[PDB]
């Protein structure tokens, strides 16, 4: 008990150093990509530690057929976060399609299905400001007797493997080495802000909801906070 | 009240042990209908005075916003006229 | 009522339609409609300052107004 | 909306689980002070206008099942849980634990739920600067604006 | 009664009493009788507010029906019969001044 | 008994409905002057007879006109609702011809 | 029947109405028609700029109407210009028009600002719950 | 394979419907199912996943 309180502390330290890293990286301006720079994305498996986290603005189109929901929580809302395959250069006849895996945000449950959305979704190009993340805590919110199902649309946590095999993409090692995260950056960078989706209290926004600058460093219910209280609830059971 | 005459008034049958142990679980078995009802109630009233809301104050507020557009357009307007004066004292050197 | 949420178009074509509108109807009332044929339509007005913030930013700007009372001036000959 | 009504109380648990702060303490508590002298402690039907008595027994209302019935009801399963120790360790049927576990869980739980949905309750007393109670509130906002060094509404 | 004050014609009192009595029993201006009696409950025995609620009646009656701005200032004969009914503004304003006549109080 | 009390309810029924201007003239006589005018008093309503602009601002210009006992509106209140009964001609023309009062 | 809704809902009240310059566009309003103006421009305080040949000749369009032929008095209401009558009670309703001007000039000046950090709860303050 | 007529069984006009620009895009929207069907020599053969027998020989 002493020790998981002991560890729990240095989480939550390390968490809040993260944190301060990361609000560091995303108040920067944000990098364009147009044109060719979109074509072939600076990032990759072994320069991602230099663009990580980092705000880009890169222009492609996203393919809303073969999205991926993995499931979340926004809000006391059971949802999904919704990735697509986001196409940056293809030829001509489309067999040979590169890009990246991009995260539109919280879409609700009720319309994650296609067919329950009151919309034809937009696949042609867009530009789109995201934050390039490595996608961790989808990455390890399955927990156990949990496993994700490809060949089908069925997801658990973020594998980012299997997404990439999912995408199709040639570019396999760009895809799996991180996912861009789609995010508004007119809105304040601290993690207190407690509003984590581009949203209002009406949500008279438009799903999918878009992601705050506080959204993309909180890692939800391992914040350096939670990890603070955890450890003192076991040195209390302990002592 | 009278017990022989109303242990025998249902077709002379008696089933006043049953209608006795009605009312204790009867007196519970309401709560949960009871209150949805009441959340029910609330929510029809709630709709009921947005249906009253729009119907009155719904056309007001779009003549409100577009006295707000028509009041833009007099401020640049009155600014387009300021400039129009200092033209015609200037007649080219503003240009 | 049932109705949608959609932010300002802001789009390049209509809000080009819009201001030229409002440049019509500048031009016709600053001169109290003395003009021969006034095309200005006031409605449209309206819908310049709901889905063109960005022009309309610039209107009320003094240095951006007096920039494009030049400019349609030099235009209008 | 319930959309709305979810998304705030969503908001006021995540707002008390991180923390705080210290001027944030100040103002929740100078809004506390407003919310509870002018609304508990007082008789909402006693205000001059129909628009005062109607929203302040809305936020009486609203204090009451979020705070006072949340309370009462954290309360009683803390006293539920003395009083299931207390059976089994005495091995009959007690009644000690309810009345004052249930008090003293009462006063430990208003509090918490006060704090977490204070500015909910000092909001829905904004009826406007025209009545005596919108202008108690306005002042109070005021107050807190210069504390925190923002807006509010 | 629906454009009239009260539940029922019980509680008009005796105005409503000779508004029944003025005409017959299947005659809808009875009701408009009847709203003569609600214009001139305060002010039949004010010597301007008897006019005040003869002009109420020419309102009451230019509002049921589209009117024009001298026809209910040329009437001939605003008297009433049994048989009168409320298919004109002449005759809707005729019986709203009967019934203002019979307000006493 | 109940069918006397339910006999007596009939007759309460009947005679309210075929006696209505004898009850009606018998209550009327069962208070004096002053109780009826104080009654009546109590229920004079408007109805919606000129409901004209009443000024709450207080440097309105139009609360010192209407508190002017010989302010003239542009038309009297049964007439706003009465169609026109003349050609537009006139109508200019008297308009145009028209003078304010003071 | 008597009690068949078991409960009735009376603590909700009716929506309050939060617009901005409402009280004042309801004042000019009224004021507007004691005045009995055939032009419905008139609704607009704005209405001398806008449409300033109410003033003039009363000719708001350029022969690009759809009211029928000028056959009844009811006809070309817009095409019709003020008159000595009609402006002077639209005169008699200056300070209320002004206020209503004023009002929502100073609305217009309002712009949201990065310290309104209750904007995204601001319904909580407009009373949208009950 | 455009049995009877292709006014009535327009199969090679669908299969190079979703072989061009447009299909391929409306496929990328997800709102119209992939292609369930083959056109290999001049047979209509029907994939394993479209859960239809296939088409009867013309004897
Ligand atoms: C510790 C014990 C403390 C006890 C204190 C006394 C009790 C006070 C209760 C006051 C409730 C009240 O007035 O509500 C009005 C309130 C009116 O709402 P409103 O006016 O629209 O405004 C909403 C508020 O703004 C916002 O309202 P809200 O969204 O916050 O709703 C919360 C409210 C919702 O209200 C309730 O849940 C009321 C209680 C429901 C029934 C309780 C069990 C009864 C079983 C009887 C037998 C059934 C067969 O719950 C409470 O306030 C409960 C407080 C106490 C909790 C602990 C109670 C334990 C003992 C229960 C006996 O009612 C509701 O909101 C109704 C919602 C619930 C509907 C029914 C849901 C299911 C009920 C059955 C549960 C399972 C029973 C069977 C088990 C086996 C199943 C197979």
Known sequence: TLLYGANQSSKARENKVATETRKERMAKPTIQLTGADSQNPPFTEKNINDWLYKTVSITGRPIHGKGMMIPAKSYGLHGFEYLVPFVTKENEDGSVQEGLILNLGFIPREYAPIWARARVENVEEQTFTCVVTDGKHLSEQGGLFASNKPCENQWEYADLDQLAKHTGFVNQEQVRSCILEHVNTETPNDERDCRHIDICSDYKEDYPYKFTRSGVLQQPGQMYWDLNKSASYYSLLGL | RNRYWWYRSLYDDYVAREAKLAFGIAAFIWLPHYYWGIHLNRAFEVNFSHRNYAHEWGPRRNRLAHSLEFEQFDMILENWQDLEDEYAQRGDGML | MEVKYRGPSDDKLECEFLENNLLSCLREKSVQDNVAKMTCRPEFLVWFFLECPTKAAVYHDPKGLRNIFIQDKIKQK | ?153 | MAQTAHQNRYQGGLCYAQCNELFSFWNPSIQQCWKGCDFGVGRVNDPEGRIEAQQMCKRWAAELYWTYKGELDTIKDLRVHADMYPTTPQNVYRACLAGVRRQKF | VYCTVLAYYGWWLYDRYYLFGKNATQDIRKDTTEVWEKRAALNKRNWGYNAHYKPELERSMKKVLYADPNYKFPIEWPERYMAETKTLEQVMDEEENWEYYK | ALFFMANTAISVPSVLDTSPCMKQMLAYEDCVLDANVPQQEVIHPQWPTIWPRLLTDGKLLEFDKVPFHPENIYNYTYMRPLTKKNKQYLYECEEERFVFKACLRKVISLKKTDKHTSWDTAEVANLQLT | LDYPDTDDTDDTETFKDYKSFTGRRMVDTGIVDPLWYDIREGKKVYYDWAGVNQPMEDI
């Open chain 4, 1 to 153: 909306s319930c959309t709305t009504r979810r998304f705030i109380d969503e908001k006021e648990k995540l707002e008390y689980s991180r923390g705080y702060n210290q001027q944030e303490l100040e103002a929740s508590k100078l809004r506390k002070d407003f919310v509870k002298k002018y609304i508990v402690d007082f008789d909402t039907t006693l205000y001059k206008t129909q628009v005062e008595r109607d929203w302040a027994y809305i936020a009486k209302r609203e204090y009451r099942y979020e705070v006072q019935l949340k309370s009462i009801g954290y309360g009683g399963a803390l006293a539920n849980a003395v009083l299931l120790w207390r059976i089994y360790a005495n091995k009959k049927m007690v009644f000690w634990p309810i009345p004052i576990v249930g008090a003293l869980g009462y006063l430990y739980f208003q509090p918490v739920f006060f704090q977490k949905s204070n500015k909910r309750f000092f909001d829905m007393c904004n009826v406007g600067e025209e009545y005596y109670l919108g202008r108690e509130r306005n002042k109070i906002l005021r107050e807190c604006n210069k504390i925190l060094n923002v807006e509010d509404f």
